[PDB]
Amino acid sequence: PMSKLSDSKSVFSKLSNKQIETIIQRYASPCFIIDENALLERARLFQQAILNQYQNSIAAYSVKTQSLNTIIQKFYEVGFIPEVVSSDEFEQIQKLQLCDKSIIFNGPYKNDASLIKALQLNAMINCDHFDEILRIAKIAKKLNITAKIGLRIADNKTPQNWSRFGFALTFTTIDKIQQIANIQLAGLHCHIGTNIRDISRFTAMAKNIAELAETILTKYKLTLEWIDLGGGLAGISPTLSDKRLQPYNPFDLELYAATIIAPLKEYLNKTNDKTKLIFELGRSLVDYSVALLTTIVGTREQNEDFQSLITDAGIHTIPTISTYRHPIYHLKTDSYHKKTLLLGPSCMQHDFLHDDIFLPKLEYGDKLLIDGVGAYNISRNNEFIHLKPSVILIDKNQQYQVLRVRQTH
Amino acid sequence: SKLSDSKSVFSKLSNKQIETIIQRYASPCFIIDENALLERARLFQQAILNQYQNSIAAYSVKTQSLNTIIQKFYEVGFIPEVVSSDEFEQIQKLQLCDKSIIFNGPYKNDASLIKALQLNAMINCDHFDEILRIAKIAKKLNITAKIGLRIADNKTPQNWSRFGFALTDIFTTIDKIQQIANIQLAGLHCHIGTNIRDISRFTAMAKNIAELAETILTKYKLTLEWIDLGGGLAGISPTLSDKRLQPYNPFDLELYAATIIAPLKEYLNKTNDKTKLIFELGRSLVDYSVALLTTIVGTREQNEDFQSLITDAGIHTIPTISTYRHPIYHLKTDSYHKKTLLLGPSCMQHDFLHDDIFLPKLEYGDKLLIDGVGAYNISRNNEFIHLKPSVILIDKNQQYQVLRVRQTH
Ligand SMILES: *Cc1c(COP(=O)(O)O)cnc(C)c1O
Ligand SMILES: *Cc1c(COP(=O)(O)O)cnc(C)c1O
């Protein structure tokens, strides 16, 4: 019964048919829309959650999840430190000419130029393979300075967190590091997956990371400068295999912060709260503040009990629709719903938004709102068949601000 | 295994040439061999023309949408074939002397239709309500629109499809079209799938289309103006579900042409060869003339029975790698191979170029060439994590031409 946008729990339930028509008139269909108020409320509440649990906590902005410059700026304005996983992302942040050049540099591939600038700005660099530690050392001699680094750890003692990415925690690697000159171990990094709703996995990882920081404490007389627990917390959209049809409530960030931090408080207290605790939540912060407006542009079948419709948005506009049941809302005053097949604007057999959803009868020109698409869609748009659609911010004054102009030939 | 001993059109490519390409345009880097590409194009036109004089090769824009490549095929005699309003507009911006164009696809917006109806384009509709939108536009212009009907060859088991009018009461659809003012049936369009290696599916479709064209001629005394047989012929790369690991030879176009045309010559001669016969092959024409140069940038494991390496290109640079076993060649000199895992420059579980290929031991700075990437990769590049790489044309003269500049922030 919450099929209708105005009757939903969506951030965008406030949007009338008239407002949607105006957005599309100005910026064309399909159109991404981002609500600034909801987005920055979530950002600030996350900072409160972690700081209430540990006062030397730092929220880092996961650029890859939502890489629009304007959004990065706004999270930076409330105290987030940019976190990048590539040299391009690293240089994106530099071009923003931010006053505070603090930055977290992750990723399996950091080119030489990126690592030079990073060292000059004393970024926090977390390495996940050995050859990179060596390349940083040679740079750390040419550049007459010692380089602090962190090590990405794989929580391979936890079955659900096992990963080939990072040094496995199942030590020989740290013995080598300290005989290495110009390199000084300064932190740990661990990122165990994505869309994690079983926060037992965060407890497990935090316990093993704490045991590691304790063993590093004794076998090496070293207190870590930072512990980065990555991201991975679940968003609001159920997976397609999930039996739940309705979206989840945005995950309780106080529950997340208390669960993951609890196994680490013992170590952090010995360090007199000088070890920084870093969090890199992306999806769970940004997903539900972004929706896609799409228009029905054709009909293949239309009978009492079934309709097959063509939309102007498909899997090349929101690729994560192939993995998640993103909520789909309509604008009709109509009680009778029928099985509905929503096809994208491609005659490719995998380009559909949903094959088993119940919606009222729709026709050419009707609009749908696809909610919870704020993570890992916009920046994956491409120029295949259809050019990239507009991205609009509903700013904190309820005024539209274009963040990406619709592409044209 | 090694590039020099390969059957690849880049077999001829030197380490110094490759290192020059990368030094000049960075890694990863797409390369397109002009000679191989246009030779394939001419052979296809020659194949279909020797079977039927009024055969027209159409260029599948979506398969390889770089403007320069489009212009080349246009100069060889190909007519542009588009499947979206954006592609349509891309072609008009080329300002070709001959405005002939094929307009396919499930979504054609009003602006493109108004333009296409007044440029004598062959417009193939796949759902009825598009027909009615054309009819109403045509009435505003006081013209009668000639349209083609996309047909689903649902009598052939492998060709069953939702896209197009079902050929299995199809005549109930053309009966309705006969009554609609400002519309006249003029052509048929059939596109039965992709990466089709069983040409029995083409011969079956051509026979069914021939029968439909005969019935139309007898029921409505109507001789069709064109028959569009679509594309879909297979490329050189096996699927990952394929048991075979080595690339196939480029499919025999003479065989394809002779077999798909033969069921239609009774009709086409009955028409004194005035029906135009259009072909829209893409993958099979362009895939093997394009390769991706990638560089090893790190190591995770290195035994003599197994190695796990990090490349600077992944599924976001060549997304068809998740579906196809694209040939991967090295430039070294060594007999000894080992199970090799090639990890993309992302720490996502699914970002790997190949997880059980045997390759010589490779190290940081070593280079690989992934062949057969010319279909459905370049235009799907995006700005997620890594910006888009350069695309380089290897001229007729073996000189380098920049078709897409490396992207930077
Ligand atoms: C993906 C990722 C994140 C964010 O992950 P989410 O699921 O969106 O929360 C943070 N840090 C790193 C290193 C990552 O790879
Ligand atoms: C995809 C497509 C083509 C090209 O298909 P290929 O497999 O690359 O040969 C031609 N015409 C239409 C309508 C298409 O959708």
Author numbering:
A (entry chain C): 0 to 169, 178 to 238, 239C, 240 to 416
B (entry chain A): 2 to 169, 176 to 238, 239C, 240 to 416
Sentences copied from the publication:
The X-ray crystal structure was solved to 2.1 Å resolution by single-wavelength anomalous diffraction using incorporated selenomethionine to phase the structure. Two functional dimers were found in the asymmetric unit (four monomers), and all four active sites showed good density for the cofactor PLP. FigC is composed of an N-terminal β/α-barrel domain and a C-terminal β-barrel domain, typical of the AR-fold PLP-dependent decarboxylases. The FigC active site is positioned at both the monomer domain interface and the dimer interface between the N-terminal β/α-barrel of one subunit and the β-barrel domain of the second. A Schiff base is formed between the PLP cofactor and the conserved catalytic lysine (K63 in FigC). Additional conserved residues with demonstrated roles in the catalytic cycle in these eukaryotic ODC enzymes are also observed to make key contacts with PLP in the FigC structure. These include E287, which interacts with the pyridine nitrogen of PLP to facilitate decarboxylation by stabilizing the carbanion intermediate; the glycine loop (G237–239) and R290, which form important backbone amide interactions with the phosphate of PLP contributing to tight binding; H198, which stacks against the PLP ring, and R151 positioned near the PLP hydroxyl. Additionally, C354, shown to function as a catalytic base in eukaryotic ODCs, is also conserved in FigC and contributes to the active site from across the dimer interface. First, the 310-helix has rotated out of the pocket to a greater extent than for any of the other structural homologs, and it projects two threonine residues (T327 and T330) and a tyrosine (Y331) into the pocket, all of which are likely to be in position to interact with the substrate based on the docked structure. The aspartate positioned next to the catalytic cysteine in L/ODC, ADC, and DAPDC, which interacts with the substrate side-chain amino group has been replaced by M355 in FigC. Finally the FigC structure has also evolved to use additional structural elements that are deeper in the pocket for substrate binding (e.g., R387), elements that were not needed for binding to the smaller substrates preferred by other enzymes in the family.
